[PDB]
């Protein structure tokens, strides 16, 4: 009976993106170059999938088209890191970018690997520390899509504010599933921390993108989102939403 009245979280499940493979040749030696390149390709495909995901999120399509683009542009890497964090959490201290591309000890020690992977690792150990459930995870990931807006405001700023409060409430129901308020503070503290995480992730990603001495392929989808983004960070026209001040 209560299912015939389907929940918001239940839909969030359905639309949760499939696991993609990296198609990484496991019989050639590794190098930071090869992994970075294979992760760029995988990532391009993850972002495209995130777009299909976002559009299926109740309310998102109703935002102005320009807003939708702005939110995916601001948050793709929040979504990447958080989904990877979750993936990894679910199975020791390894980043499980894909069933056939897991960043193990040896890989971690590759030139320049840990200096970024640790940030993904931080997301992973937080999920594990808090024993975040799957439903809290779903609600939390949707809130990451909505974690950043232009300093001057979105065009559908009112509808954005609504939708976002809707999912803050959805997270609350997930948590309830007495220390409920305490958990809400913990989970929303994690959400907030994602800004610093992604801030770092993007520096080491953008830097790699701008360096000419590093012949490194990004797929077009990503290259686009990256180019259009570097400036906005210099400019700081990005308002980062905080649950706790």
């Amino acid at each position: 009976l209560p299912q015939l009245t389907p929940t918001l979280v239940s839909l969030l499940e359905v639309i949760e993106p499939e696991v993609l493979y990296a198609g990484y040749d496991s019989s050639v030696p590794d190098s930071t170059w090869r992994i970075m390149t294979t992760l760029n390709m995988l990532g391009g495909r993850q972002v495209i999938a995130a777009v299909k995901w976002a559009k299926a999120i109740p309310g998102f399509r109703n935002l102005h088209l320009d807003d939708q683009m702005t939110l995916l542009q601001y948050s793709w890497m929040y979504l990447m890191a958080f989904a990877l964090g979750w993936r990894s959490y679910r199975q020791a201290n390894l980043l499980c970018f894909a069933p056939d591309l897991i960043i193990n000890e040896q890989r971690m020690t590759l030139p320049g690997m840990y200096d970024q992977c640790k940030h993904m690792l931080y997301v992973s150990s937080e999920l594990h520390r808090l024993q975040v459930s799957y439903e809290e995870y779903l609600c939390m990931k949707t809130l990451l899509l909505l974690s950043s807006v232009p300093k001057d405001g979105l065009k559908s700023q009112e509808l954005f504010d609504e939708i976002r409060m809707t999912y803050i409430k959805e997270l609350g129901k997930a948590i309830v599933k007495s220390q409920n308020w305490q958990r809400f503070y913990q989970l929303t503290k994690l959400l907030d921390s994602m800004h610093e995480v992604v801030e770092n992730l993007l520096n080491y990603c953008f830097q790699t993108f701008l360096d000419k001495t590093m012949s490194i392929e990004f797929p077009e989808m990503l290259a686009e989102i990256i180019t259009n983004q570097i400036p906005k960070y210099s400019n700081g026209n990005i308002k980062k939403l905080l649950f706790h001040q």
Partner: peptide, 10 residues
């Protein structure tokens, strides 16, 4: 930004 625009406006 056309492909993102394309993907969204689909």
């Amino acid at each position: 930004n056309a492909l993102l625009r394309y993907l969204l406006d689909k």
